[PDB]
Symmetry: C2
Subunit: 109 residues, 2 copies
C-alpha cells in the first residue's frame, strides 16, 4: 500500500534548499517572482510529460524507466521551488495546508 | 529565521488528502491529469497574485492581510495537488526530492575562490 517516506519533511526540504541557494546565487533565489516563474516552468515540464498521455493508456505507475525518472524529477523540482517560494513568502506551508484543507472540505462538500 | 512547522509531513498530507479524495467523486480526484490540471490552475492562481507586483514594491511578507490569506491558500493548494499527483503516480515524493537535490547539486556546482 503506497506511502511516502517519513522524511525529508517540508522543513527538511526548506533547509536543504536554503543551503543550496546560500552557497550559490542567493539573490537569484531570493526573488519571489523568480521562484514563482521557476515553479511555473517546472509545472510546465510536468505537463509536457502528460500532454500526449491517453487517459486510456498505461498510467504514470506503468510508465517506462526514462519517463518515471523524469516524472520523479519534475515533481521534486515543483516541490523544491514551492517550498522555496513559501519560505521566501514567510508562509508556514505545512500549517497553511491544514488550514486550506479545512477550507476545501466546504468548497468540495 | 523563518521556519516551517514539523508537521504535517508530506506523508500526513498524502494521507489526509486520500481521505479527502475518498469522500468525494472518485476519479475527479484520481485521474492523474485532473490532478495535474488542478495543480496547474493553482499555480496560475499564484501567478495572478504576483502578476502586477513590482519586484520593487513591498514583498509578500509585507502584503495586505487579504492578499496574504490568498497567498497562503494558493501555495497550500499547489502543495496538496502536487502531493495528490505524486501519490497517484506512486512517486515517493520526499525521497524523490533528495535524489533531485543531489542532481541539482551536481548540475549547479558551487563557486569557490
Amino acid at each position: 500500500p503506497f506511502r511516502f517516506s517519513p522524511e525529508p519533511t517540508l522543513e527538511d526540504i526548506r533547509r536543504l534548499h536554503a543551503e543550496f541557494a546560500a552557497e550559490r546565487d542567493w539573490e537569484q533565489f531570493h526573488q519571489p517572482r523568480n521562484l514563482l516563474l521557476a515553479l511555473v516552468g517546472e509545472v510546465g515540464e510536468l505537463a509536457e510529460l502528460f500532454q500526449w498521455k491517453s487517459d486510456t493508456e498505461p498510467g504514470p505507475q506503468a510508465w517506462p524507466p526514462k519517463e518515471r525518472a523524469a516524472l520523479q524529477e519534475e515533481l521534486s523540482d515543483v516541490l523544491i521551488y514551492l517550498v522555496a517560494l513559501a519560505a521566501r513568502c514567510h508562509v508556514d506551508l505545512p500549517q497553511a495546508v491544514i488550514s486550506k484543507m479545512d477550507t476545501n472540505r466546504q468548497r468540495y462538500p
